[PDB]
Amino acid sequence: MYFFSVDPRNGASKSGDVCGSCCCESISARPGEVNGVMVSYAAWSAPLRGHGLTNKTTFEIDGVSVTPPKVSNAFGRTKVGVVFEGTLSDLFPNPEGEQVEYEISELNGPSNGVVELGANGAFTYTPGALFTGVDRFWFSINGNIGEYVISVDPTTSELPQPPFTTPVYVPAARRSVDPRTHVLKFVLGVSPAAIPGDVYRLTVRQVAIDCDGNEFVHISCYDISIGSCG
Amino acid sequence: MYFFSVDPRNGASKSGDVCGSCCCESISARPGEVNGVMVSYAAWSAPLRGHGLTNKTTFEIDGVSVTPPKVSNAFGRTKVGVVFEGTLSDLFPNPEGEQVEYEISELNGPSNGVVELGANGAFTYTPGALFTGVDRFWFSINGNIGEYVISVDPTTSELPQPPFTTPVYVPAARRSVDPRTHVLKFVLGVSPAAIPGDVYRLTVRQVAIDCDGNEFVHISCYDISIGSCG
Amino acid sequence: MYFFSVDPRNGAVCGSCCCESISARPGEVNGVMVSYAAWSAPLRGHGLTNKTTFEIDGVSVTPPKVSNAFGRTKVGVVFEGTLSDLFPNPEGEQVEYEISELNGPSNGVVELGANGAFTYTPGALFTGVDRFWFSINGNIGEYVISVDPTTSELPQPPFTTPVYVPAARRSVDPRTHVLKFVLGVSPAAIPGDVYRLTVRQVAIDCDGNEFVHISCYDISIGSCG
Amino acid sequence: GLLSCINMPESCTPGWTFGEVTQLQANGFVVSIYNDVTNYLRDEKNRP
Description:
It is classed as virus. Keywords: Myophage, redox trigger, virus. Structure of tail-neck junction of Agrobacterium phage Milano. The structure is cut from a larger assembly and holds three copies of chain A and one copy of chain D (48 residues). Chain A is mainly beta and 230 residues long. Helix content of chain A is 2%, strand content 43%. In chain A, strands 1, 3, 11, 12 and 13 form a five-stranded mixed sheet that branches. In chain A, strands 2-15-14-4 form a four-stranded mixed sheet, with no helix packed on it. Chain D has 48 residues and is mainly α. Chain D has one helix at 18-27. The chains are: A mainly beta (230), D mainly alpha (48). Chains in contact: A-B, A-D, B-C, B-D.
C-alpha cells in the first residue's frame, strides 16, 4: 500500500534536493502484483474550509516506454459444457527462426476451467460444469508472455468481447474517498504481460468541494516503473 | 523452521537491498528432510485494513540447476498377500559395470513391508499382510540414489499410478493461513534423490482480501539450495 | 553422558562435512542425549515420536586381524574348543593367548589350556547365549557359545559389531523434546578407527503429519580414555 | 602484466581495431595485456 502526500499548492517549492527533477512521484511495481494506493489530500483540502473530497476522481494511463510485445494476445469463443480446443503457434511471429518452448504458468492459470497443453502449440480448455462468463489464461511463448481469453456462452445466443486488459490498469469501481480525513484510496493492477523496465504514467484529477457546492480541481502524476523483484 | 518476513511493497525496501538483492530469499535443504516454512504478511497486509489473507495460495517449483540423475526410477505392481520380485540392474545405464553395489539404505527403507536384497541386482519385497496401498523404497546403485515404488492393490484390479515424487516438492494440502496474525504456513519436503549443489526456485502467489471481498495479489520467490550435510 | 543440541534449520561445528564428534573407549557402554528442543518447539505440535532410525558406517576400519567363532553346545555338558586356527599368524610369531578377566564369560568359566585350548563349563541349569573376549598376542577377538536346552538346538545370533546402538534402549520425551539412546563399543574395536552414526528423527504436528530431520556423529574409537 | 613466455611475431595490423577494443573492454573480455577486469557488465536487475 503506497502512501503519498499531496503538495499543498502554497507556492511552496519541492523536488530539488537532488539532480533530475522528477516531480511526478515514482511507484515501483511487479508484473502480476495488485497493490493499493492511498493519497492524502489533507495538505491541500483542509485549509480550504468546505465539505472535503468528492467521488469524482478520473484517471488516465499513458506509457512513456511501451516496449512493444513480441507476441500478441488472442480471443476465443465456445458454448457451455462443450470442450474447447485451440492452437498456440500462429500467435508468435518470429523474425529469426527458433524453437517454441510453450508454457502455461500455473500461477496464472484459468479460473473456471482446466487447460491441457498439447505436444506442439495445441491446448484443450475444458470449462467447469455449470459456468458461463469469461475466462483468461496467460501463456509464455519462449518467455514472451501473452494472454488468451475464452468466452463461454450459456449455449444460447452469444457473448460480447472483453477489452484485452492492458499492462497497467486501474479497476473500474474500487475507488473511495473519506471526506473525514481527506484520503483517496484506489487499486493498481499490473498485468503479468508487463515487460520489465517499462515506464508508464498515471495522471490523477481529483476535485474537492466548497461549503456551497462549487469545485476545486487538483491534478498530479505518478510514474509507474514496471520492474522485476518489485 | 524457516520464518520469512515479506516485503511491504511501500516506498523504501528491506533486507540488504543496500547493493541490491539476490532477489530471492534463500532456503538451505538436505536430501530427505521435511521442514516447515512460515511467511508473515504483516508488513504488507496490515496497512491494508481488511480481512487479512485467504486460502487461495498457489506455488510453482522450477529448477535453475538440476544436474539430471544417473540412475532412472522404476515402477512395480503386485496383488495383496502375494510376494513381489524385482530387478535392480536395468535402471543404471552405465559406461561400465565396474563394481555396481546394489544398496538399500535403511533410513529410507519400506513403509509397510520388508525387502531382501539379492546378490546381483535382485530384490524380494514382501508386503505387509492385510495391507493395500502405495509403498516406496530408495535404493543406491554405486552412490547414485533412485526410488522404487511397488504400490499394491487389494487384488481388485490395480492402483492407477503414483506421481513419482520429485526431488523437491510441496505437499498437496498441509498449508494454512491465519487471518488474525497474517501468517501463512506450508511444509517443504525434499526427496532423498536430490543432488547436492542443485538449485530450485519456488514462487508463491498469495492473495489477500479487502473489507468488501476484492483481491490484492502478491508474488515472492525463494531459491532452494540442496546441500548435503545441512 | 553426551549432550548435543540440534540445529533448528534456519540456515543460520561443520568440522569436515556436517557431522558432530563423539569420543569412545573400547568396551564402554555410554549414553547420549540429543535435544530437539531447538528444532521442534517452534513447530507447535505433539512433540517427537518413537520412530528413530540409526545407521552405522565406518570411514576408518582397520580390518581385524583375528577372527571370531561360534558354538552350539548343550545344557550341563562341558564344551571343548581350540584357539589356534583363529589367528593366521602370518609372520612367525609366538601365539601367546589370553582370556581377559574383564570380559570373561557370563554364566560359565573357561580353562585356557597350554596351547590355545579352552574348556567352557556352562552354568548348571542355564540355556541361552554367552560370549567371551580373547586376546591373541594383543589382537582381540570374540568367541560365542550357544548352550541349548537339550531339546534340539538354538538359533544363531549375529556377531556384535565394533560400534553399535542397542536394539531397544531409545526413548523420547515429548514434554522436553529430548532423545535418549545408548552407544555400545565392542572390546574388539581397534583404536584409531572412526565410524559414522546417522540419525533420522521424525516430529509430528497437531494433525498427525511428519517432519523429518537427519544428523550425524563421528565416533572416534580412542584408547586410554 | 606483460606475458613473458609468448614471443608472438610482430606485425602492423594488430587485431581488434580500436572500436573492437572498446567493445571488448566495455563488454567484458581482457583483450591484450590491458584491462584485467572480469566480465560483469550487469547485476541482479540494475546493470551498473
